[PDB]
């Protein structure tokens, strides 16, 4: 069980003005530290994030959060569960920013909401700072589908937070778990008039305005003023990356088919070859990216389920992936980093989840 921690700066806040916080269990024998971000998709204007206020309000608003959590996956403190980092410093970060993490902008008479998704994480990591993550050598930023992608988003900030307050000793990296997405055309499409109908790269497009939203200063410069949405695609923002991240992406992500509008519920030719080019794509956008683990599953996200040590690629397991790139930050006989299925076809890989 991890215990919960409002923050102490009321003014770094969720969506509804109630203060954000995390919960921590500590582990006095570590210099390693795991910092998880939730996801849970986004909303991007008043009408929207309204409906989501009424029927998803716990990522919007403290005030009915429980005092603790069980750790689970990666996020677990028994070897049995947890091969990789069980004995680790463990934290996981709610998401109630509803910003993919991205937001800088306080509730005010002009803004019904707060988006501070981006100040969320620095305040965390400022407050850690004063229970233990002073002594840190490695603090792992992990998290999974739009925390993953928020992973992308903040991890270079982490650094250069901790670089300017005086701890260029703590080694700061980036887990990124199911939130590397192809803006690609999708099997049936519509003009974006609302939210059913809005396809991903016009959707951000509101929400970083409607947010203040914040994104990776080197990608900044490239994409430029009203572009920023570009960095939130993962093939684009991680190349302008100096953190080194682990990107683990199922190759037929269920997000990524439910915005690309395919619903596998007897497939014919056209979705067939639908179907194979995505896997296709996602394989090419990773064929550079030295540590990352790609399985031919349709599934969404893994990193904190219990079961999460069952998927193998090439024969290995991604706790042992994940101990094989520690090995390589200090190519290893037998201990891979690059793992990225060849089959083109969902669950071609035996060891996908049922
Ligand atoms: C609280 O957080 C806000 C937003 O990041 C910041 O402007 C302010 O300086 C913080 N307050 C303190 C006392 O650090
Ligand atoms: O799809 S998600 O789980 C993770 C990513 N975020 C924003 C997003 C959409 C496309 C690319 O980035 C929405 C929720």
């Known amino acids: 069980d991890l215990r919960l921690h409002l923050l102490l700066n009321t003014s770094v806040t969720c969506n509804d003005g109630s203060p954000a916080g995390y919960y921590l269990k500590e582990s006095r024998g570590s210099r390693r530290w795991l910092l998880f971000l939730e996801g849970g998709w986004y909303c991007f204007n008043r009408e929207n994030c309204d409906s989501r206020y009424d029927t998803m309000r716990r990522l919007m608003s403290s005030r009915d959060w429980p005092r603790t959590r069980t750790g689970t996956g990666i996020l677990s403190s028994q070897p049995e569960e947890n091969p990789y980092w069980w004995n680790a410093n463990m934290v996981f970060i709610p998401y109630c920013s509803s910003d993919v993490w991205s937001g800088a902008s306080s509730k005010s008479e002009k803004n019904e909401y707060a988006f501070m998704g ?134 037929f992500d269920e997000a990524q088919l439910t915005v690309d509008n395919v619903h596998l519920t007897p497939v014919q030719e056209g979705l067939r070859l639908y179907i194979q080019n995505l896997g296709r ?66 669950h071609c890989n035996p060891s996908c989840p049922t």
């Open 118 to 251: 981006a100040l969320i994480i620095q305040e965390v990591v400022r407050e850690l700072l004063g229970r233990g993550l002073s002594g840190a050598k490695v603090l792992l930023l992990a998290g999974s589908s739009a925390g993953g992608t928020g992973v992308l988003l903040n991890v270079d900030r982490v650094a250069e937070q901790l670089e300017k307050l005086g701890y260029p000793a703590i080694q700061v990296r980036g887990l990124a778990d199911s939130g590397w997405f192809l803006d690609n055309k999708q099997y049936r499409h519509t003009d974006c008039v609302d939210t059913i109908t809005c396809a991903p790269t016009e959707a951000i497009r509101r929400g970083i305005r409607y947010w203040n939203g914040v994104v990776p200063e080197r990608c900044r410069r490239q994409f430029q003023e009203g572009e920023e949405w570009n960095c939130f695609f993962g093939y684009k923002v991680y190349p302008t990356l100096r953190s080194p991240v682990f990107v683990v992406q199922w190759l």
């Open 281 to 346: 794509e996602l394989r090419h956008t990773l064929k550079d990216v030295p540590a990352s683990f790609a399985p031919a599953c349709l599934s969404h996200e893994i990193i904190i389920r219990s079961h999460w040590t069952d998927v193998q690629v090439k024969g290995t397991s991604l706790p042992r992936a994940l101990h094989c790139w520690d090995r390589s930050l200090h190519p290893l006989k037998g201990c891979p980093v690059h793992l990225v299925d060849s089959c083109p076809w969902p």
